[PDB]
Amino acid sequence: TRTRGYVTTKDGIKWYYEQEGSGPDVVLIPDGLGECQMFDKPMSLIASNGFRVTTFDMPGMSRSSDAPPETYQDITGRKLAGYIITLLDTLDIKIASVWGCASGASTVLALCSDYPERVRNGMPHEVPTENPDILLHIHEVDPATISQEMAANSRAASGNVEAWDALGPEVHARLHDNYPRWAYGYPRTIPPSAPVKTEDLHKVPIDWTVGASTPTKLFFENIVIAAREGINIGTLPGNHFPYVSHPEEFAKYVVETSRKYLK
């Protein structure tokens, strides 16, 4: 059944994490906002397809907020993979299908490249390689301003405002606090460290996606890199948060995608 709890790791981080189901492992890493409650409904669905699903709030974010300051500053996919790895060890997850959007997509690839042996297959979605105009000075302003701004930016990029609002008051209060921390630690340093070099993308299976309704320019490069490299590239319904806006379809893609690599 769904287990909800904490575990503190050797690196200082008090992770909030959730688990459900049984079978082969699926890890659901959050996008930059670090809020694993976005995964709630799809988590049940994947699990019920014969999977053990793991997810967690990200370091410094939400209920994982009791963490060391460096674990949410100067963030890269590789920094994040390091922490995920040491968390997976405590949970005895040896090999996993790994999903992530945004900076969490940065993390998928970082793991695919740096810890290939722990990735059965990586599912990155919208790897930041250039930030849009709206983020260029997001780290320069005040917390309240960022929370006001980033809540509308995320809300607009929800891909389904009904479902985005429907995440609820508890979640959006947590998100209100993550927004500022996210701006100070993620936007500048995530795109330039995107592991999309040739030598990152071929050590294990990768199925790349982009949001169906995301404006082409935002992750245009994602599609060209994947095509050039012969990496499976496609879309999913919605935009930046398919697991929230289109939970069923998202959970079907994870299931379908992971399915083809099981042996």
Contacts with ligand ZER by CB under 6 A: the residue count is 19
Contacts with ligand ZER, 70-109, as mask; x by CB under 6 A: --------------------------------xx------
CB 199 within 8 A of CB 211: no
CB 103 within 8 A of CB 77: yes
What amino acid is encoded at 136 in this protein?
L
Q: Which of 13, 26, 29, 33 binds ligand ZER (CB under 6 A)?
A: 33
CA–CA gap between residue 158 and residue 221 (Å, rounded): 21
Least distance in Å: CB of 217 to a copy of itself?
4
Contact between 167 and ligand ZER per CB under 6 A: no
Within 13 Å of residue 119, how many CA atoms lie on the same side as its CB? 29
| Partner from ligand ZER, a copy of itself, none binding residue 210, C-beta < 5-8 Å depending on class | a copy of itself
| Partner from ligand ZER, a copy of itself, none binding residue 214, C-beta < 5-8 Å depending on class | a copy of itself
Of 185 and 205, which has the nearer Cβ to ligand ZER?
Answer: 185
CA–CA gap between residue 219 and residue 65 (Å, rounded): 29
Query: Smallest Cα–Cα separation from 126: which of 165, 157, 153?
Result: 157
64's tokens: 């994982």
CB 5 within 8 A of CB 77: no
| Partner from a copy of itself, ligand ZER, none binding residue 235, C-beta < 5-8 Å depending on class | a copy of itself
Applying CB under 6 A, the span of 56-64, 131-139, 161-169, 253-261 interacting with ligand ZER comes to 131-139
Query: Smallest Cα–Cα separation from 99: which of 114, 115, 113, 112?
Result: 112
Site for ligand ZER, residues 213 to 252, rule: CB under 6 A: 218, 240
Binding-site ranges for ligand ZER (CB under 6 A) = 31-33, 102-103, 128, 131-132, 135, 153-154, 157, 182, 186-187, 190-191, 218, 240
